[model samples]
Target: GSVFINVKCRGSPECLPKCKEAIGKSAGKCMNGKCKCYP
Candidate 1:
């Protein structure tokens, strides 16, 4: 298992997808309006 972290833009409608692509991680998910990435 890995310790998780996130990068969120608060209330941007386009934040999730942008975050996912911008971050360089193999495992991640968007939950509760936040983009979470694996450590």
Candidate 2:
């Protein structure tokens, strides 16, 4: 479990939403300025 990346947004709440928008599934978590992906 070492998947990590900087997200476009600057919030965590929109992580899943952004994930769905970019990918199509909620397979990640957003932090303060980054996103944690689990794939």
- In terms of TM-score, the best-performing candidate is 2
User: What are the models' TM-scores?
Assistant: 0.35, 0.44
C-alpha lDDT score of every prediction, in listed order = 0.52, 0.63
Question: How well does candidate 1 score on lDDT at residue 11?
Answer: 58
For each of the candidates, give the backbone clash count. Answer: 0, 0
Q: What is the lDDT of residue 17 in candidate 1?
A: 59
Model 2 per-residue lDDT at 25: 61
Off by over 4 Å in 2: 1-11
Error in Å for residue 8 of model 1: 4.3
RMSDs, each prediction? 5.0, 2.8
Clashing pairs in 1: none
- How far residue 19's Cα lies from its native spot in candidate 2, in Å, is 0.4
Summarize candidate 2's per-residue lDDT along 1-39 as a digit string, tens digits: 635655665666667766665656667776656776654
